[PDB]
């Protein structure tokens, strides 16, 4: 049942199904199914309109999600970026932004390796 | 009815100290609770043998603290005399409460 912006979870327990939304996680999912009183274990396919409507209502009118989230987050990074800010720099240069080592590792933010040439003299290990 | 503590680094410095007491006050006070051996608390120090690098050698040193009790009931008059001031062991320390 499309809840958050064009979000259709189905054929799975509503709590996890709810997870397929940008802004919802085990935590919040477990919440809405409480403050809306809905056996979380029921399948989305076995939900009830009364329930499917309450869910939409609560979740949508209670949190900033999907497109909005992505937008705000985007805005934020652009922010510390526009201003001088160090983190901005790291976001610019595309390097880790939480005081991590960039000598080794840091692959997640650098992507694949861009190998080069070097010095194979003596135990370079 | 006195409760005495006997701690130390030498286990013979305390045996020649708990008995230094019991036998004495064993003829002027209750038959005493005999010397009770409290478990020991060991302190380990592990050091890299050499001054520079070689972090795989190491030598082990421990400073074990032994303990005793004794505990004589009936804080008699003729007891605090065979004892009181007739100490001998020097590596021992003594606590008293009753």
């Amino acid at each position: 049942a499309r809840i958050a912006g064009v979000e259709i979870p189905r054929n799975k327990r509503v709590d996890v199904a709810l997870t397929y939304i940008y802004g919802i996680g085990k935590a919040r999912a477990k919440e809405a199914l409480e403050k809306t009183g809905i056996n979380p274990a029921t399948r989305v396919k076995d939900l009830t309109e009364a329930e499917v409507v309450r869910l939409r209502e609560y979740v949508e009118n209670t949190w900033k999600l999907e497109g909005e989230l992505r937008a705000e987050v985007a805005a934020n990074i652009k922010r510390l970026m526009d201003i001088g800010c160090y983190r901005g720099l790291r976001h610019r240069r595309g390097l880790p932004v939480r005081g991590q080592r960039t000598r080794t590792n840091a692959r997640t933010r650098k992507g694949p390796r861009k190998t080069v040439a070097g010095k194979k003299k003596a135990p370079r290990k | 009815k006195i409760r005495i503590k006997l701690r130390g680094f030498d286990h013979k410095t305390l045996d020649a100290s708990a008995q230094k007491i019991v036998e004495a006050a064993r003829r002027s006070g209750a038959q005493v609770s005999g010397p009770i051996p409290l478990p020991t608390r060991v302190r380990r120090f592990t050091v890299i043998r050499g001054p520079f690098k070689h972090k795989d050698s190491r030598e082990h040193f421990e400073l074990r603290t032994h303990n005793r009790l004794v505990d004589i009931i009936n804080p008699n008059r003729k007891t605090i005399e065979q004892l009181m001031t007739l100490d001998l062991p020097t590596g021992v320390e003594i606590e008293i409460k009753t």
Binding site: P123, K125 | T46, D56, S57, R58, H60
Partner: protein, 127 residues
């Protein structure tokens, strides 16, 4: 009236008090099966009795402390083994050959320096 033993395994001791009865076994105030809740090993513990056709002529009250369940299982095995000979030395003759009367000496070997754990040695490269 009563018959004692002890039994120790991998640093776990157990009080084994045998008494003529059915086959009831109290371990720390619980039924044998209540304590050894689904641990296929359990059976073993009482093996010394079955060895001498006992079990169906005895009862046992067991106290245990130290170590772990399977280590306790063995302590009990030795306690019960000793208590049985405490009731009758003639039990050795055929109880001994099955070992039951021997204390398992193997214990956690010490952790040496330079190793990762007693024997596992650190991994070395381009040697």
């Amino acid at each position: 009236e009563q018959y004692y033993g002890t039994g120790r395994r991998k640093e776990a001791v157990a009080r084994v008090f045998l008494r003529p009865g059915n086959g009831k076994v109290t371990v720390n105030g619980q039924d044998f099966n209540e304590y050894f809740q689904g641990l296929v090993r359990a059976v073993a513990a009482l093996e010394p009795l079955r060895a001498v056709d006992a079990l169906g002529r005895f009862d046992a009250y067991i106290t245990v402390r130290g170590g772990g369940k399977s280590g306790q299982i063995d302590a009990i095995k030795l306690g019960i083994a000793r208590a049985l000979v405490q009731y009758n030395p003639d039990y050795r003759a055929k109880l001994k050959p099955l070992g039951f009367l021997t204390r398992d000496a193997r214990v956690v070997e010490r952790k040496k320096y330079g190793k990762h754990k007693a024997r596992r040695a650190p991994q070395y490269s381009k040697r």
